[PDB]
């Protein structure tokens, strides 16, 4: 809310840090000076949601006596580097998906002379996250902990990228790999592990809990509250208001595994199955409209109602029964925002 | 030489351990069988001096009484990791250069189907290198100091490449910015430090050698090997023999920054400057031919044969300076090799 403005003033000292090291080295200053365009440009210009559920989890879990000017600095510098996992996936993701912008702005690669460069540029902000950890974590006894989370995060996304690619390659509708058990395996590999687990975790590990059961017990409960948020992202892509949501939705234009197509096709009559075959993916709008009324005919915005008051009961008995001997303000705080 | 087909036989091995761990995990399978797709294209087909420098060196180190079966399949995994890391490289420069083919074949993102869906597959590929590690080197003593090499190297890789981008813009002549400083520059980072320093330094650490000093002391006899060998590779690009090569280059249409161009114009009186400039970074072959025929003409090909004789010299000075208390041969094996 406030402990915003305050994350994103930390930025500054990231990207000044990330950007100097050559003083013996003076010849590579010119990548330096790209690597801090690529920087501000890319990291800056979202909500900052999961950085700072790093950075929330942290007060909570450590016992006050133990947040110094150096623990909070190295809770601000770990939420960065959960915006820089993010930064990289979207630079990346943009490219393969030739989208035209991102934050409301010019995609990064998009911009003139950038272009297929940004592959590398991604590559860049990946690694920027490492050094972070490397220069404000090394002597901390949870540091190889956050370095296997950041690694493993980052291949849990990968490989559900990959999954989604398979799934619904763009230009080419088959609507017999939208089951609703693929759907759920694509949420939970590509957005609800480094959306939701990641952040909690990395706060967990530098609070000392470190235990195998404890971070099941808390990836139960995120996870959980990913697919959430997905479902919730996938119904509001059409049935928003886009001046509460912020932009028009292409999901269906896109042809992509949506939590709507997937119930759609689960309850559509033969031929309906062929209105949707003969329309989902379409660049023109009549296309877009009739797909759209056909969801409305199936009062999917019901059995989404529907399932948003389910699964905040569920989300809610998860923590009651997997959040201790964590302060179940932990989850509750994220499920206060995605709800 | 014949350990090479040795570690070739073990490429099975790496890649049935990567593409199997879901048995609680069914729907993932068609991600997993699509990066079995991905490691079996890309990992095979070269000439594995760098993975297997990993295995020869790590040979000569260890006393000799540590070295069971075990030890070993972590030196073959470990190689297989720096293998990884090439194969990351190359599958996204040669999405960034537009490159055709690689190792004689399609390059990857030029199959059909795949196209830019080979950033994610090459981020797989990154993330495979830690997939082993912890699998193998989990319990080692020196395992975090192999991720910190592995994320370094890369880092180095990426920001020397962001440098090469920079520097050389295929599409736009600017001879301004090819000069010694800058050409050296590039090398370190973008080539000498993975292909080099990177495979001998891992095997010091499954040694035990992990010595400030020692590591120093082996990287600067490296790093200038690495040199040579791509000012090697530059003046071959033009001079080799294709039959003995492999290949006819291309630096020159590419507007790359070669050593050869960086000395021609060390040596260019102003009207040759401009017989570079209306020359250099065209497809047509008389404007190659003429940039050839100006390099014959500053007698090039003989300022490269006095500059490996002196640089043989300074490695050998550089071995013997630096080498102790390493066993020398751990040198002198890729010494032999690059000359
Ligand atoms: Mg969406
Ligand atoms: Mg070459």
Known sequence: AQEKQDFVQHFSQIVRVLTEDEMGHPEIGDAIARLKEVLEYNAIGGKYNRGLTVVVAFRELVEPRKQDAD??????????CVELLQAFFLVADDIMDSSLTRRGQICWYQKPGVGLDAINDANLLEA??????????????????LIELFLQSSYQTEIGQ???????????????????????????????FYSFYLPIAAAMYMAGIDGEKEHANAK?????????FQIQDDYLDLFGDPSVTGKIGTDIQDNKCSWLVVQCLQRATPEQYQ????????????????????????????????????????????????????????????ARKIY
């Open 220 to 228: 139960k409960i995120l996870l959980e509250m990913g697919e959430f």
């Open 162 to 192: 990959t999954l989604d690619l398979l799934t619904a390659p763009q230009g080419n509708v088959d609507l017999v790999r939208f089951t609703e058990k693929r759907y759920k395996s694509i949420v939970k590999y590509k957005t609800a």
């Open 275 to 334: 209105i949707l075959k003969e329309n989902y993916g379409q660049k023109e709008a009549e296309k877009v409209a009739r797909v759209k009324a056909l969801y409305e005919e199936l009062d999917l915005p019901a059995v989404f109602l529907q399932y948003e008051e389910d699964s905040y009961s569920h989300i809610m008995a998860l923590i009651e029964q997997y959040a201790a001997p964590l302060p179940p303000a932990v989850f509750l705080g994220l």
């Open 128 to 145: 920027c996250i490492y050094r972070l950890l490397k220069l404000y974590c090394r002597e901390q006894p949870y540091y190889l902990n």
């Open 71 to 80: 623990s909070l600095q190295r809770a601000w510098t770990v939420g960065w």
